[PDB]
Amino acid sequence: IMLEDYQKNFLELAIECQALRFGSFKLKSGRESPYFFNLGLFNTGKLLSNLATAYAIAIIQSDLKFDVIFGPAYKGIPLAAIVCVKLAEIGGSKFQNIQYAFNRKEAKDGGIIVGSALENKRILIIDDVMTAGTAINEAFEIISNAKGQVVGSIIALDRQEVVSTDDKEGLSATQTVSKKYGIPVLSIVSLIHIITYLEGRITAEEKSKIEQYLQTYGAS
């Protein structure tokens, strides 16, 4: 019903740098979507600084307790690094000693995990986006092999869409993960927040097409 400042600022910048675009788009499904999102267009030092901030404040506000931030290769690698830093920078004394880690796709001269031993540490997984859960599934396999404990996940944008329109539980991608693994899936923003930001920027008519999109596909 209201957006935190960090969430306004994130959405303002995503639209400005064209990471978030509005129009008529199709997913793999073939499903219509009224926007497109590509976190990769946060691609300058300024925009990465702001992104790091936005993830960090989301994590700080969740009150989740964790020891390590893990990013799945490849796109999670820089995000885990920049967020680990910004948490120490703005989070106070409880985030000074957070570690980061990530996986190589393949070992070498050994190691799949780059970082300190995950054994007995509480892990937050950070990525850009979640759809079928395949990066999450791979991270759990890797982590649980190393005796780490995953306590949560965070993505940039939660689409808050039902994975299937036939499915009568009406579970989104993040919900599905959260149920299977028993952990929170946090996000900087969700579809409801995009909708709220748009109030007073778009026409009555346009407002009614987006607040019907969510009737057909919105989760739970």
Ligand X SMILES: O=P(O)(O)NP(=O)(O)O[C@H]1O[C@H](COP(=O)(O)O)[C@@H](O)[C@H]1O
Per the annotation, binding residues for 5-phospho-alpha-D-ribose 1-diphosphate are 28, 74-75, 104-105, 108, 127-135
Q: What gap in Å lies between CA 125 and CA 101, rounded to an integer?
A: 10
Single-letter code of the amino acid located at 63: D
Distance in Å, CB of 156 to ligand X, minimum: 10
Phi-psi region of 67 (alpha: psi -120 to 50; beta: other; left: phi over 0): alpha
Cβ proximity to ligand X: between 151 and 177 the closer is 177
- Identity of the residue, 118 or 163, whose beta carbon is nearer to ligand X in the bound complex: 163
> What is the CB neighbour count within 10 angstroms for residue 90?
13
Give the three-class secondary structure for 54: helix
Annotated binding site for orotate: 36-37, 131, 159
**CA dist., res. 50 & res. 55, Å (int):** 9
Q: Which does 43 bind (CB under 5 to 8 A by kind): Mg ion, ligand X, a copy of itself, none?
A: a copy of itself
25 Cα distance to chain centroid = 21
Q: How far apart are the first and last CA of the chain?
A: 17
Residues that bind a copy of itself (CB under 8 A): 40, 43-46, 48-49, 52, 73-75, 77-82, 84-89, 91, 95-100, 102, 104-106, 114-116
Crossing angle of the two packed helices 204-217 and 191-198, in degrees rounded to 10? 170
Q: Out of a copy of itself, Mg ion, ligand X, none, which partner does residue 78 contact, by CB within 5 to 8 A per kind? A: a copy of itself
Question: Which listed option, a copy of itself, Mg ion, ligand X, none, makes contact with residue 216 (CB within 5 to 8 Å by class)?
Answer: none
Report if residue 75 touches Mg ion, rule: CB under 5 A: yes
52 binds, among Mg ion, ligand X, a copy of itself, none (CB under 5 to 8 A by kind): a copy of itself
Site residues (CB under 5 A) for Mg ion? 75, 135
